[PDB]
């Protein structure tokens, strides 16, 4: 069970991975916003790894 601190840490690590040169707007610090994007990032890494495998 990843706590909200580790959740927000992985969100912060994922923000610079996704945006990169794009600016990062600020989010309201609540468990809902932190919770929803975690599953999106978790499946995005999976599908991007799979598509890496398909491309190679």
């Amino acid at each position: 069970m990843e706590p909200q601190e580790e959740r927000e840490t992985q969100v912060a690590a994922w923000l610079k991975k996704i945006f990169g040169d794009h600016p990062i707007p600020q989010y309201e610090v609540n468990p809902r916003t932190t919770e929803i994007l975690h599953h999106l990032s978790e499946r995005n890494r999976v599908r991007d790894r799979d598509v890496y495998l398909v491309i190679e």
């Binding site: 799979d50 495998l53 398909v54 190679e56």
Partner: protein
């Protein structure tokens, strides 16, 4: 010298019959068919 000529010819025959054996005994495929080969990385990506 006359015997040495036939010695050279028979040695030539022996080497040209030596050179044919290794071509028919090459383990290119190295049950391998049942398992997934690590060289066949397409199947590995499929499993991953």
């Amino acid at each position: 010298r006359q015997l040495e000529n036939l010695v050279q010819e028979l040695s030539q025959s022996n080497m040209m019959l030596y050179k044919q054996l290794e071509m028919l005994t090459d383990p290119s495929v190295s049950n391998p068919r049942n398992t997934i080969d690590t060289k066949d990385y397409s199947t590995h990506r499929l499993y991953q």
